[PDB]
Design a protein around this ligand. Structure first.
Ligand SMILES: OC[C@H]1O[C@@H](O[C@H]2[C@H](O)[C@@H](O)[C@H](O)O[C@@H]2CO)[C@H](O)[C@@H](O)[C@@H]1O
Length: 213
């Protein structure tokens, strides 16, 4: 898949939808975590957003490699696709608007986003907003910030759980607090940096081009 799309930001702490078995042709589904960021090899644990105890791992956070390139994660809803075609796929995003215009973010899809424009990427970042399901309230008592869009000042990251602070600050640092920047995207082979965090690699990963930083 390739094309253009709109971005939002989120972190709801819920078990990612690609953490369920049988969703896509993969070696294994995305690792969810317990409330203390220990990975759950058992894909049957119920989502903390449904009264269970499985949450998004803190390592599903974005980070910068250099001033031009970051790696991270997103919830995707793509024209012509299904969960079976995007779960655990990677995509190189090139931003086309906002202060980050021209920068590159390579993401792995770990969940399904909502319909928003032609190709929505809901980009993971702690403190970007829980939205509809406040899993973080159950995981550790909640994150600060607006329901949609999350926190508004960088200092609000200071009270986050330790493992969520780097991703929280990335939003204000490399990402320049960009507000829903647009992008073009291309599906690519997943960098090992991403699959080593989620443990999930698509059987069709090699059908797509290698990403070159
Ligand atoms: O609904 C998708 C996504 O929205 C996020 O909030 C958006 C909001 O919908 C939009 O109106 C505003 O302009 O920007 C914010 C931040 O992107 C919300 O944080 C997510 O939880 C939600 O999944």
């Amino acid at each position: 898949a390739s094309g253009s799309g709109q971005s939002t930001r989120y972190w709801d702490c819920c078990k990612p939808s690609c953490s369920w078995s049988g969703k896509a042709p993969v070696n294994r589904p995305v690792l969810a975590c317990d409330a203390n960021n220990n990975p759950l090899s058992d894909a049957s644990v119920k989502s903390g957003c449904d009264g269970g105890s499985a949450y998004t791992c803190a390592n599903n956070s974005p980070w910068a490699v250099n001033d031009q390139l970051s790696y991270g994660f997103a919830a995707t809803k793509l024209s012509g696709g299904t969960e079976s075609s995007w779960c655990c796929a990677c995509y190189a995003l090139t931003f086309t608007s906002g202060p980050v215009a021209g920068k590159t973010l390579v993401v792995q899809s770990t969940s399904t986003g909502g319909d928003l424009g032609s190709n929505h990427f809901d980009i993971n970042m702690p403190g970007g907003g829980v939205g509809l399901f406040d899993g973080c309230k159950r995981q550790f008592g909640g994150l600060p910030g607006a329901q949609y869009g999350g926190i508004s000042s960088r200092s609000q990251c200071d009270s986050f759980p330790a493992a969520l602070k780097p991703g929280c600050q990335w939003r204000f640092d490399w990402f320049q607090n960009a507000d829903n920047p647009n992008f073009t995207f291309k599906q690519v082979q997943c960098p090992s940096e991403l699959t080593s965090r989620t443990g999930c690699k698509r059987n069709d990963d090699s059908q797509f081009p290698v990403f070159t930083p």
